[PDB]
Structures are given as C-alpha cells and as structure tokens.
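Appendix B: complex inputs.
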Amino acid sequence: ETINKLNRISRQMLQEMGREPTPEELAERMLMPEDKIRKVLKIAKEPISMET
Amino acid sequence: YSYTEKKRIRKDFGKRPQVLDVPYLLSIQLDSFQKFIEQDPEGQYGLEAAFRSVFPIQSYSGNSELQYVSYRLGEPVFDVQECQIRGVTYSAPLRVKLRLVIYEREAPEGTVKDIKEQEVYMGEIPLMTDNGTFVINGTERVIVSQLHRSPGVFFDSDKGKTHSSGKVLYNARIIPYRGSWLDFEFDPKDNLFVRIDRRRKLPATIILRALNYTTEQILDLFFEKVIFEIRDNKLQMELVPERLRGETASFDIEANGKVYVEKGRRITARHIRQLEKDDVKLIEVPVEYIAGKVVAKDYIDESTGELICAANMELSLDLLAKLSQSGHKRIETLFTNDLDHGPYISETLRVDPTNDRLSALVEIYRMMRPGEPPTREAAESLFENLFFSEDRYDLSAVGRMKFNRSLLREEIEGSGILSKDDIIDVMKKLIDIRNGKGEVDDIDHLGNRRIRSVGEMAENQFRVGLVRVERAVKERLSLGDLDTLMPQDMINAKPISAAVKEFFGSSQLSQFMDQNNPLSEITHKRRISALGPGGLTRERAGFEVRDVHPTHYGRVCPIETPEGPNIGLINSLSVYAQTNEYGFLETPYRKVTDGVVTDEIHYLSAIEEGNYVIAQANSNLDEEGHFVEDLVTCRSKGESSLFSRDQVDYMDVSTQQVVSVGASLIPFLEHDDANRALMGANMQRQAVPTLRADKPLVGTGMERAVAVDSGVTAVAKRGGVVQYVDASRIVIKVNEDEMYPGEAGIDIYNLTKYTRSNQNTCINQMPCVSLGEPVERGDVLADGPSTDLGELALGQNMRVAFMPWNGYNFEDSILVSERVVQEDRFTTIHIQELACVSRDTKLGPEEITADIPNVGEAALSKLDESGIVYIGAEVTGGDILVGKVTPKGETQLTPEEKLLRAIFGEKASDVKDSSLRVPNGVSGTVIDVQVFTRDGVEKDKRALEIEEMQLKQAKKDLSEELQILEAGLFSRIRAVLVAGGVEAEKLDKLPRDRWLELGLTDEEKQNQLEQLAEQYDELKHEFEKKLEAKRRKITQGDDLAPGVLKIVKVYLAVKRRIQPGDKMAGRHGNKGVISKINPIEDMPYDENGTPVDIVLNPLGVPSRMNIGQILETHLGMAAKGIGDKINAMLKQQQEVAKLREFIQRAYDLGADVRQKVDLSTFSDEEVMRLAENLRKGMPIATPVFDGAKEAEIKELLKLGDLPTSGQIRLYDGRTGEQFERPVTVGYMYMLKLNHLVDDKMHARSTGSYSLVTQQPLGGKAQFGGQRFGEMEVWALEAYGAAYTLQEMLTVKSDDVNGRTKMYKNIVDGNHQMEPGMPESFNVLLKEIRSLGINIELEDE
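Resulting structure:
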C-alpha cells in the first residue's frame, strides 16, 4: 500500500513539477520522515532474472 | 583559396572537374531530426503528424471529447557537458496544449457546456547534439538508420522449390506500414488463395465474398463475357476475332459466305484479320462447343422460380435442353484459354465452401481466433478492424505511392486504409502476372527498399506511447466527471517517456558511438543497418540481402561492410547520396542535353534510374560538353554497354560517388582487390589518435570534408581577425560586414581539453591559428583528435622498406626501428575512468576515510587527509586511489588462529579493506577527480574543496566571458563615437560608464548607441542571473541510485607507447603485428645514410592482390623527395624567387589537371609559411578512381633526385654490405589500430569461481580463463594425453576439493593430483534427478 501510494503521488507530482519528484519533495508531500521513503523505494525492486 | 587553404595547399592529381562538391556528410541525422521536432503547420512528418493522427480522443459515446491544439519543447535543464558529467538524458520537456469539451443533451452539433484548455507535460524526449549524437545515460550514442522493405505491394515469384514439380508459383503481398499483412498465392494446381497473415491458407474468393460480392459480379470483374445467342436455331456464337488467337478449333467457323476456320486446324491471325475486315460479329457454331464453357450468372424459370443452373457451372446438353424449353436464348459464358485468360477464379470458387457474406465473415472470424464460436456483429467489427479501420491499419503516403506505382495508377495520394478497388486490382494484377504479362519484382532492388532514420523511428515509438495512453484516456473519459479536473489528471507521462527512453536506451539500432577517430564518428552516423525491429535477423536472413544488387551503384557503398557474422546487412551510405522525400535512396547525376552536359544536377531514385541511360564518370569531354568519341560506355538497366554519342541521358557527377567516406580515403583504391579494400576501409575506423597529427602525404582530397564536417574540430562561424589564442579558448574579433547590428559582441570558442572518449582514447582540441591572423568564414581554428590544419591525420607517415629481414616479418609481421619509439610518434594517450561507489549495507555504512587496516604508510603517502588521491600523482598497479572500508562482523575464527589471537591479544578489526585500486598492470596520472554525494549526507573536506574549485572556475570563466565580450563591445563603442563627434584624446580618460551616456547627434548613430547600451545592461543582468543559476546547479545535491551514499570517480591518463604485440596497418588492408623493436644501428640504410623505419614483408603483395600499397609507397617517396629538396633550398637560405620557381614547377607537373596555383600569393609571408609547412614533405591528393597514374609518378620522381624505378640500393645495418637486387623504400602512411597488447594480455593462477557451477568465470579483468572447449578436449583425446585432460577438466577447473588439494600439494612442492569427481557433473545429476528421471551411481 505504501509502494502504491509512492507510485501514485509520484505520478501526480511528475505532471505538477515537471522534472520528476525528488524524495525531499516527498517529505513534505507525505507524512513519512524521508529516510524511510528511501528504503521503501529500495524494497520495491523486482529481482533481475539471472539469465537476463 | 581561403586562408588555411593557402597555409599548406595539397597537390592534387585527377582529371575530372568536380561540379558538385561533397555535401554535408551528416545530413541524414540532422535533416531527419529536423523533420521530427519542428512546428509543421500541416500534416507533414513530425510530432504534429503523430498528434493529429492519434487525436481527438473521444469517450465511449458519452459526448466528452479531448482534442489537440499545439505543442512546445522547453529548453533543457542541463547543458551537454554537465549532462555527460552527471548521467541524465540530454532531453527536453514536452508541453502540449490540450482542449477538453463536453456536449449537452440532444445536440451533437450543439454548444458545449465548457471547454478546458491548458498545457500538460508528457515526458522528456532527447535532443540531438550539433553533431548527430544523443546522450542517454552519461554516454554519447548514435541511432543508426534502418533499411527495410517499402510498404506497398510486392509481386514475388518463389520459383521452383514447392513440391519439386518444376512449376513456378506467384504470390502478391500487401505490406502495410502499421497493421496486418495480406498475401495472395497460387498452389501447384492453379487455385488462388488468400492469407490475412502468415496464418493458414484460405481460399481467395472468400475475401471477395467478405466485401459484399456475389458470384455474378466476381466473374464479371475477373472475366469477359462470351454471348451465345440462338438466332432462330442451332445455338450460334457471337464473335470477336481477337478471341481466337493462338487457338485450334474443333470445327469449321464460317462467316459471310466463306469457311475461314477449318476443322482441326490452328487459327492463324490472318484469319482473324480477314474476319475483322469482313465485318464479322455473329457466327454459327454447333451445340458441341458449349460442352466446355461455364455459365456466368444465375439462370432460372420465370414463373416457377426453379433453378435451371446456378452461377459458375459447366454446361452439358441436358442444361441446354433445359434452357431451350424455358425460352431463354441469351447465354453468358466465361472466356477461357490456356495462355491468355486463365480460369483461375472459377476454380477458386469451386474450391470455396462458403456462398454468402455472413458465412464468409464467420469463416474469417473462426479462422483468426480459432476454437471459440463466432458471432455476426463481432465478425463484422473484426473485418472492419483488419483492413478498413483508420486505427489498426495504415499505409503511409509512401505506402500509397508504391501501391499506386506498382499498379500503374494515376494519383500518388490517397487514404491510408484499403478499399474494394485496391484489393480487386491487386488480384487482377496477380492474375495478369500468372497469365504471362508483366514481371515480378525483387527485394534487393533499392526502389523497393526504404531507409528509415532517427526521426521516423522516434515518431513511431512516440505513437506507441500515445496509443498506450489513449487506452487510459478512453477509460477515464468514459467515467469522466463534469468539473473536477483540469485535463491533466487523465494522462500519465510514464508510458510516453517510458517508450521513447526505452527506444533510445535499448535497441539494436541505438548504440554507443565509436569515437576514437573523426572518420569513425562520421561513418557510424552514416550507417545503413538492416537489423533491428521491423527488419531481418542474422539467423533468419539470408543470402540475397547480403549480396550486392546493381541498383546499389552510387547509393550504397559496396566495399565497406563489417566482414564477419553480418556481411552486407550493415551497409554504408555513399558519398553523394541523399535521402528522397519518400525515404528512398537517390543519387546525383548531371543532366545531358542534345550533346552538351549541363552543370545542373538531378537527384534520381532507383526506379527512376532504370528508364534513362546513364553515362560514365570516366569519360572525356571538351569545353563545349561534347563527348570526344561518337560512342561511350554507359549503363542502361543494370547492364554496362557502349551506346551512341547523343542517346545518353545523364552523366555521373564525379569519380567518387560509388564509395563511402570510409573507403574513399584509401588512395589508389582502383589498384586493389575488393577483398583487401574491404578490410582496409573496415579497419580505417580503428586508428587510435596519436600524440601528434601528421598529414597523410598520399591523400585523396576527401580528408578536408571528413575533418571539417565532423564534429571534432572547431569551425569558425563568422570570420574576422583573431584577437586571442589560448589552449583553453580562441577569441575572434568579427569583421564589420559579417556582424549583426544588434547584439554586437565578438565570438568566443571554448575548446574541449583532455577528456574521455567512449573507447577510452583521449579526444582533445588544440589551436592551429596564431594571434592576429585573418580567418575566412567556415575556416578551421582548432584541430581535434587526429586532425592537422583541418585535414584528417589518422596515423603517421613512415619510411618503409619491403624486404624479408631475418624472418622477423614472417607471416604478416611489421618490424619497427627504435627511431619511431624514441620520437614518441606512436605514443598514444588513453583515459580510463575508475569508479568507487560507497553504498549502505545492512551491516553498516561504508566510509571514505584514509585510515586503512593493515597497510603501510608508504602505501598511503599518495593520499590526502580526506582519503581521496591527489591530482597528478603517477600511480602504478596496486596503488590505492580511494581508501574505502566496509564494516563487517562475526569473524568465526578457527582453532589455533584463536589460540594465536589469545597469545598476542590483537583484535580482529570490525572492518574490511574494500578500497578502489588500480587494475593489474597499468600506470599513468590522476587528472580529474569527481565526488558525487547524496543530498542530506555530510560532505567531506575534499568534496567541498572540489566544489570551491569548480565554483571559482565557473565564476572566473563567466567573468572572463563578460569582460572580454564587453571589451569587444567598448571597442565597438569607441568606433561609433569617432564618427560624428570624435573625442580623440578626450574619450579614453573619461570612464566606461560615461560612454553609454555621452551625447551625440540624433541619427542612426544615436540609435546605435542606445542598442549597444541596452545590450551592455542586458548582458550584465544576464551574467548575474546565470551566475546564480550556475551556482545553484553546482552546490546542490546529485541524484544517485537508490541506496548509495557517495561515488568517487578518478580519471587516469595512461600514456602507452608501443611494444612488440601491438597492431599496425596501412590503408590498404595490410595488417601486421610489430615483432621486434630494433635499434637504429641495425636498420637497412641507403647510400645517403637515412635508416628506414619500418621493414614490411614483400610476400604479402603478390598473394593478397593489393598492389596499390606499392604505388602509395612510391608516391610517398616522391612526396618526401620534394620535401627534402624544399628543406635543402630553405636550409641554404635561397631567396624566395627560387622557392617560388621550384614550388611552381612542383605544382604544375603532369597532364591536364585541376590545380592552378600561385603566383597570386603574397611575396614572403604566405610563401615562406608554405615552405615551412612543406619541409616535412609536399602532400599529394589522389582522387579515388581518377587520380595519379604511373607516368605522373615517374615524372614527379624526376623532379626529385630519386631514381625513376623507385628502388634504392640499401646497405644492411649489421654486415654493412650491399643487398643484391635494390629494394623498394618509400613513405607509407600507417595507422596504430587499437588492438593494443596490454589490453589483450592476462593470465590467471587462481581467482574467482562461478556460483551455480564451480568453474572459473571467463572475462577480463575478472581474471577469466582460456576456455578449454570441446574441440580442445577432442585434441587431447587425439593424443595419448589422458592425465592432462583429467587435470584439465577436474582439478584445474571444477572439483571443489581437488583444486585446494592441488594448491596445497603444489606449494609443498609435491606434483600430484587427487582427482575426485567434478562438481558440474554433480549438478547435472541433481538437474536430471530434479526431473522425474532417476539417475544414480552404482555399486563398486
């Protein structure tokens, strides 16, 4: 749910600001202390296939 | 001549006056991407085409529609240099004005309730640089132009191979630009068939029954009607006499008194013409001739409605007796023949199961989505969405042009979708090809080959993004509210930017620019690939695509393609060739009148070439344009033949149009075999840029176009007087006439110093102009890598002797004197980029501290207090550049190691040395250090030091920009105030602020003062705001990977000289590995005493048929002989009249040429600098197929004191006695290819091992291991070697116990192996055992 909130808010802000949102903007955009947003961004990565 | 043209003017042979100069060599890339991103007011190709095609988006009949207005691209946030430093795309945003409307109740034409019009962001698209290069992820990438089949209609044969019957088939094919294909083909027994894809063979006429056609009008469209009337009796036959051609009748055909056609006789056309002259329309036949005919339409009884005969039925006597009693005397039959009119459609109808429209649509909908039951309206919408929907099927303007052209239509425009007339005309044309008239096509023909480019492929991926987003917009506007949103919440910019970044980031057509040579850039941008999406692959295709078709002449170079797996699929675009409006290739020719060759030129495509007949470039004509013979060699239709004097239509432009830019820089290319010329032009890319640049003595005249018109050198945009020359910058004072009235200024050119190219070589710019020198517009100022004075200097010219010298030149080997390596004339400069990342593990974060466990202080003396190496400390292999330690824990110590720790009390530390180290076996200098740090992390001391360094550098540099720019501006102000109110000595005392506000007469001069004043103030404010912007770009944080703290990058500059093992090559394809690097004392030397520098091998020259290296060697000897005579006449201090005389004789010298020269140059100041530039050797241009012959080389050698035969006697360096049979010495221009040996050499004792199978993983510098593959195992089986193989694939490679047992036994000095079992075989057992298959090992 947190990952889908991050993708939704970073979908909304990308057409508001224009470049892409930095997580410093996600600090004041959301209610999380921006050091947890880094690890939520880290956990949400699917592993590479080892035959890629 | 211009100013650098008279600096060192190149002697030019050649006999053809060039009438069209070499065009802008990168026009494909830049012109394509100018078609891509440009505000086109119409439906011209571009982004406007994609928007106007995919928009308007409408709701699911909910009366809410989104339509389009315009777009705009913003300026990039980051310029190209900072973009290459940081790693982002060099991109631009994409603002689009969109307009949302909602309609009201029961008014489709009525007024909307509201409109909502705003701008919206949809992704970033990358911009092309000024040279044709994109930047995607830190690197500099080139998108190669693609070659594929033109959308349209192709009539192929596919002869013979089907079922070995000897019969040819024919297949027509409609290839769209976007949609499903279409095929029509015959079978071995004369039945037509349709295919909507490469799916199952369907009967043909069902697609006609899918277009609302009954059997009547199908047979009407594909056949002509023979009318049988019963004129009162006997069932007569109406006759057109042309219908009887080539036929044999079974009876006597009589017309108007006379029996013309006899029974059992073939009908001659004399009978036909007599029947035409005798006014013959209707003749009498028996009832037996209708036994073979087939009825056209439906015949019934009138009142009862019963069927006499349905359509497409043969007629027997029973059906004739049935149609006699109903009363019908009109009979319509189908005209058949075995040669002229084949009854193919009738046979296809007899094969076809269906009858009506609905069963046809049911058959197609069952035969495209099989297994599911059909439905009427779903089948109707399917066949709507196959070929006739505007959405899922599209021929472009090129598709419609070829589709009309190969059907011999009139209009060259039309709708994208098909129509009934289109498919019916294609079927008519296919039946006509089967009936013997017309011809098939061939796919190698470059009139049926379209060349795509960057703009078109980016446009198509952008359209993929727009349909992927319009699915979501249809989903949203179907659920669309009334007023809750500005119209940007509907659209996501993830798919659009995702698609375009996926194309530029990952494709077979978008690759790293080969950037180690200006030639390599300019020929990688000019590349015509046939691979990639929408094109053939190396596995599937194919031989005819690899081969050269005769329509490649002057469009695609035949002698440049990468020899290897893909030969000919990676073609290169010819020199003079452009790209047509419709995308095809087209080449220049000179229009020929009655006899006079006019200098006007017409670009001709391939299918327009075959109609005309085209003359030869190598022809001879007087000043009146008349050919000197009455017959001349030409080509008409792919056939070289000799035609008349005034039958010609076009002449070739120049002698060079058949080759590429890569091959045309091989001189004497007409004297080499095409194999070695292919290899020579294939390897002329791979020259490393040497430390100097050294002017090829044997050039082809194409060197200046490749030098200027690439992107490496700095071309002046406005000429003037050179004000300031530094290695960093060149500052030009523009002349008065070339200067704009507003924004006066002067020009400044910031050179690019020592920096990293993609192939690790050092791209560098160096000034070639001095202070206070006049320059022309378009004149070179700063030589790039491998460029001298605006020429192309790929390598260096060296004295060569062709003799076998003690076997050191055995197979192909080169042998070089020490005079080369002492001069550092092949010493090249490489730049490597080592990187040290510092992440955050879950055991703790890493540090960049200088304190490292268990290293010496002497190993750390090359570091600072911050732990990052100083700039400019020569390091070797193993030195520590970035001291980085990673936290670890839980040591799990053993027995007696734990005993030892207890004894000595030494704490096993909580950290591990994972520092960045120099790779094994290089050297060099640390020249540039960068520290990227995530924002919110403490920046250490050297990071702030680098920030202060770059901040002072940017502020000093922009202050110098503003200061020298306003120095030019105040020097213009002084030139203004002298005219009309001079202060000669009064002006320079009063300050610069009080020049802008001094009074003067109201004229254009006061308006000029107002302009220069406001430009001063605008540049001041612009300076201030862009300095603040540059500071906020430098000081801010940097985006990084998720979960990495900081990255320290260190640029090494290695200076690699030469050693045995390197590779060198002339431009003719004579490869060679330097074998021994002799001292100067051992070289062969002639009687003057000059030691030859490179001794090649003569045995390669008769075998490999490249004789042109000998001619290039002789003419190089000629060039350096002229250079030595000029050097002697300059060393003796001869007066300038003697030098003028000798240079005049050197430049006249030969047949009728194209090289008129001085005396028009200055008295001393231009001639003496020319002689200073000719003392190393007078260059010679040889335009490729037209240039210098043998007798001109002999006459140039007679100008020097050299022997005419070109072979000096030479003395051995060791025995000191003369070689018998005097040998060929000369000056060959040779190149150092970048297959250097120290990048290739490594070895492995014991390193890492692969995870899934315990084997040493292969690579470099992963320590690799030479893969002892399957053939080498067969080789050791072929010997008696068995212990070698047992250790070769168990102990040295695979066994997890055996390798450590072997290492122990070796360091104990006991050579012995304990073999055991390989590990990967145990993996194989677990893999078969992890199937349902039991596999075991057995008892004893």
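The first strand of chain B starts at residue 11 and ends at 12.
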